[PDB]
Amino acid sequence: IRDTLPGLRNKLQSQLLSIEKEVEEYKNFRPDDPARKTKALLQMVQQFAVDFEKRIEGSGDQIDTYELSGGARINRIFHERFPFELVKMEFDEKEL
């Protein structure tokens, strides 16, 4: 029983280390959240802006490699297939 305790203590210290960071932004919570609401709104807006820029412009910080992954290159395939829609549709000869 007393032999096992060091392992339990260190493992639970690691788990409390994992949860304490989340508790840091959760020290306090009042009804109607007078300032947490504004802070979280700013966080969400910044996340959306940086993700839009990452999706289209191609900013740093680990853009996903799974799929063709976002409008940026779909938007490019438009900008470089439209020069095929120009060629294809327009034609006439021997009437001109």
Partner: peptide, 27 residues
């Protein structure tokens, strides 16, 4: 997120109690 946050709070309190019990038992 609200249920997750409350369950985090309860989990943190339970872990605090568990480490207090380890402290008072290891002695």
């Amino acid at each position: 997120q609200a249920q997750r946050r409350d369950e985090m709070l309860r989990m943190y309190h339970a872990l605090k109690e568990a480490l207090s019990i380890i402290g008072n038992i290891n002695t």
